Amino acid sequence: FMADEYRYGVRSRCNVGFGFWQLAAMSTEELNQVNFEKVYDAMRNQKADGG
């Protein structure tokens, strides 16, 4: 018995995503806006190809 399919993954855009390497949340002061929402703010702050 067999299965067949045509597919492959894609990269949407280089500046619409982020991944960080820490998640502690101790008292919601280690990462609240230090590394968890720091990336949120980094995404908020970006420039296109026109300055």
Binding site: Q33, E37, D41, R44, N45
Partner: protein, 50 residues
């Protein structure tokens, strides 16, 4: 003769939005303290500056 000033706007970069909203936007402070500066000034966040 002093001047009547009624600050109602707070403009900050996207990097200070978290702090701006936690000053104006948080209703309780600590283990319950109200917030004397809650909704005192409305905040707008912009990406043109900084």
């Amino acid at each position: 003769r002093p001047l009547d000033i009624r600050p109602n706007l707070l403009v900050v970069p996207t990097t200070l939005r978290s702090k701006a909203k936690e000053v104006v936007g948080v209703q309780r402070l600590a283990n319950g303290a109200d917030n004397p500066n809650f909704e005192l000034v409305q905040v707008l966040d912009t990406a043109w500056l900084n």
